[PDB]
Amino acid sequence: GSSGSSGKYTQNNFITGVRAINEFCLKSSDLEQLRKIRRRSPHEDTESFTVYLRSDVEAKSLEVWGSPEALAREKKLRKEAEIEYRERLFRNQKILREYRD
């Protein structure tokens, strides 16, 4: 059989690969360099994936960029981006309906 994946965003003890490569902005060769954990094969006969340790990926960003501040510079933008979106949406939703519109 087969099985796709889920969307949305969520933080846990473990972080996906592509999720860290896009967030921490690293190289595919760097991630693979880290320890490859498969949750001790929590489910067989099904397409699995490799997960990395948040603590490990963190250092990988400091050893490359040099410091966590260098990366934060890019994180800020991506962060404010979503805010700028939901922002205009907030006022568009309003608290309720009042008077004509």
Side-chain angles (χ1 to χ4, degrees), residues 2 15 18 23 29 32 38 46 54 63 75:
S2 292
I15 182 177
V18 65
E23 286 278 303
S29 304
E32 67 170 28
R38 205 163 105 176
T46 38
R54 188 161 111 170
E63 74 102 291
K75 304 241 84 261

PDB file of all heavy atoms in Angstrom, residues 2 15 18 23 29 32 38 46 54 63 75:
ATOM      1  N   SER A   2       0.183   2.411   0.078  1.00  0.00           N
ATOM      2  CA  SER A   2       0.878   3.693   0.081  1.00  0.00           C
ATOM      3  C   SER A   2       0.294   4.625   1.138  1.00  0.00           C
ATOM      4  O   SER A   2      -0.641   4.264   1.852  1.00  0.00           O
ATOM      5  CB  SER A   2       0.790   4.348  -1.298  1.00  0.00           C
ATOM      6  OG  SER A   2       1.529   3.615  -2.259  1.00  0.00           O
ATOM      7  N   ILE A  15      11.972  16.901  14.237  1.00  0.00           N
ATOM      8  CA  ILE A  15      11.666  17.778  13.114  1.00  0.00           C
ATOM      9  C   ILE A  15      12.016  17.112  11.787  1.00  0.00           C
ATOM     10  O   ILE A  15      13.071  16.491  11.649  1.00  0.00           O
ATOM     11  CB  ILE A  15      12.422  19.114  13.220  1.00  0.00           C
ATOM     12  CG1 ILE A  15      12.038  20.035  12.060  1.00  0.00           C
ATOM     13  CG2 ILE A  15      13.924  18.874  13.238  1.00  0.00           C
ATOM     14  CD1 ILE A  15      12.678  21.405  12.138  1.00  0.00           C
ATOM     15  N   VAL A  18      13.234  18.116   5.302  1.00  0.00           N
ATOM     16  CA  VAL A  18      12.925  19.258   4.450  1.00  0.00           C
ATOM     17  C   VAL A  18      12.432  20.441   5.274  1.00  0.00           C
ATOM     18  O   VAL A  18      12.601  21.597   4.883  1.00  0.00           O
ATOM     19  CB  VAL A  18      11.859  18.900   3.397  1.00  0.00           C
ATOM     20  CG1 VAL A  18      10.532  18.582   4.068  1.00  0.00           C
ATOM     21  CG2 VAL A  18      11.702  20.032   2.393  1.00  0.00           C
ATOM     22  N   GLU A  23      13.742  25.838   7.088  1.00  0.00           N
ATOM     23  CA  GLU A  23      13.705  26.712   8.254  1.00  0.00           C
ATOM     24  C   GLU A  23      15.108  27.184   8.625  1.00  0.00           C
ATOM     25  O   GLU A  23      15.386  28.384   8.650  1.00  0.00           O
ATOM     26  CB  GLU A  23      13.069  25.989   9.443  1.00  0.00           C
ATOM     27  CG  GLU A  23      11.563  25.829   9.322  1.00  0.00           C
ATOM     28  CD  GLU A  23      10.808  27.075   9.745  1.00  0.00           C
ATOM     29  OE1 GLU A  23      10.998  27.520  10.897  1.00  0.00           O
ATOM     30  OE2 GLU A  23      10.029  27.604   8.925  1.00  0.00           O
ATOM     31  N   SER A  29      23.336  17.940   2.247  1.00  0.00           N
ATOM     32  CA  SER A  29      24.485  17.147   2.665  1.00  0.00           C
ATOM     33  C   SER A  29      24.725  17.284   4.165  1.00  0.00           C
ATOM     34  O   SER A  29      25.252  16.376   4.807  1.00  0.00           O
ATOM     35  CB  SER A  29      25.736  17.578   1.896  1.00  0.00           C
ATOM     36  OG  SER A  29      25.529  17.494   0.498  1.00  0.00           O
ATOM     37  N   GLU A  32      21.826  15.121   6.187  1.00  0.00           N
ATOM     38  CA  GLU A  32      22.163  13.707   6.079  1.00  0.00           C
ATOM     39  C   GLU A  32      23.369  13.366   6.951  1.00  0.00           C
ATOM     40  O   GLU A  32      23.521  12.231   7.400  1.00  0.00           O
ATOM     41  CB  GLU A  32      22.453  13.338   4.623  1.00  0.00           C
ATOM     42  CG  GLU A  32      23.708  13.989   4.068  1.00  0.00           C
ATOM     43  CD  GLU A  32      24.104  13.434   2.714  1.00  0.00           C
ATOM     44  OE1 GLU A  32      23.206  12.977   1.975  1.00  0.00           O
ATOM     45  OE2 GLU A  32      25.310  13.454   2.393  1.00  0.00           O
ATOM     46  N   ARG A  38      14.884   6.628  12.837  1.00  0.00           N
ATOM     47  CA  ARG A  38      13.651   6.170  12.211  1.00  0.00           C
ATOM     48  C   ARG A  38      12.622   5.769  13.264  1.00  0.00           C
ATOM     49  O   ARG A  38      11.777   4.906  13.024  1.00  0.00           O
ATOM     50  CB  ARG A  38      13.934   4.987  11.283  1.00  0.00           C
ATOM     51  CG  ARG A  38      12.911   4.827  10.170  1.00  0.00           C
ATOM     52  CD  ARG A  38      13.433   3.930   9.059  1.00  0.00           C
ATOM     53  NE  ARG A  38      12.828   2.601   9.099  1.00  0.00           N
ATOM     54  CZ  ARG A  38      13.056   1.662   8.186  1.00  0.00           C
ATOM     55  NH1 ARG A  38      13.871   1.905   7.170  1.00  0.00           N
ATOM     56  NH2 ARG A  38      12.468   0.477   8.292  1.00  0.00           N
ATOM     57  N   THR A  46       5.259   0.119   5.502  1.00  0.00           N
ATOM     58  CA  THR A  46       4.758   1.439   5.137  1.00  0.00           C
ATOM     59  C   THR A  46       5.904   2.415   4.900  1.00  0.00           C
ATOM     60  O   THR A  46       6.893   2.417   5.634  1.00  0.00           O
ATOM     61  CB  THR A  46       3.831   2.008   6.227  1.00  0.00           C
ATOM     62  OG1 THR A  46       4.326   1.658   7.525  1.00  0.00           O
ATOM     63  CG2 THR A  46       2.414   1.481   6.061  1.00  0.00           C
ATOM     64  N   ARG A  54      16.109  18.141  17.145  1.00  0.00           N
ATOM     65  CA  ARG A  54      16.066  19.598  17.179  1.00  0.00           C
ATOM     66  C   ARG A  54      17.368  20.168  17.736  1.00  0.00           C
ATOM     67  O   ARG A  54      17.865  21.188  17.258  1.00  0.00           O
ATOM     68  CB  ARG A  54      14.885  20.076  18.026  1.00  0.00           C
ATOM     69  CG  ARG A  54      14.656  21.576  17.960  1.00  0.00           C
ATOM     70  CD  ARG A  54      13.252  21.946  18.413  1.00  0.00           C
ATOM     71  NE  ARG A  54      13.258  22.660  19.687  1.00  0.00           N
ATOM     72  CZ  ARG A  54      12.188  23.256  20.201  1.00  0.00           C
ATOM     73  NH1 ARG A  54      11.031  23.224  19.554  1.00  0.00           N
ATOM     74  NH2 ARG A  54      12.273  23.885  21.367  1.00  0.00           N
ATOM     75  N   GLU A  63      27.224  25.996  13.359  1.00  0.00           N
ATOM     76  CA  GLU A  63      28.511  25.573  12.820  1.00  0.00           C
ATOM     77  C   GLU A  63      28.671  26.026  11.372  1.00  0.00           C
ATOM     78  O   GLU A  63      29.788  26.193  10.881  1.00  0.00           O
ATOM     79  CB  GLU A  63      28.652  24.051  12.908  1.00  0.00           C
ATOM     80  CG  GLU A  63      27.809  23.302  11.890  1.00  0.00           C
ATOM     81  CD  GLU A  63      28.624  22.797  10.716  1.00  0.00           C
ATOM     82  OE1 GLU A  63      29.092  23.632   9.915  1.00  0.00           O
ATOM     83  OE2 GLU A  63      28.795  21.565  10.600  1.00  0.00           O
ATOM     84  N   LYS A  75      14.718  34.251   9.307  1.00  0.00           N
ATOM     85  CA  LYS A  75      13.535  33.747   9.994  1.00  0.00           C
ATOM     86  C   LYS A  75      12.539  34.872  10.259  1.00  0.00           C
ATOM     87  O   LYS A  75      11.328  34.684  10.144  1.00  0.00           O
ATOM     88  CB  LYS A  75      13.931  33.079  11.312  1.00  0.00           C
ATOM     89  CG  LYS A  75      14.947  31.964  11.148  1.00  0.00           C
ATOM     90  CD  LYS A  75      14.397  30.631  11.629  1.00  0.00           C
ATOM     91  CE  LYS A  75      13.573  29.946  10.549  1.00  0.00           C
ATOM     92  NZ  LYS A  75      12.113  30.161  10.746  1.00  0.00           N
TER      93      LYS A  75
END
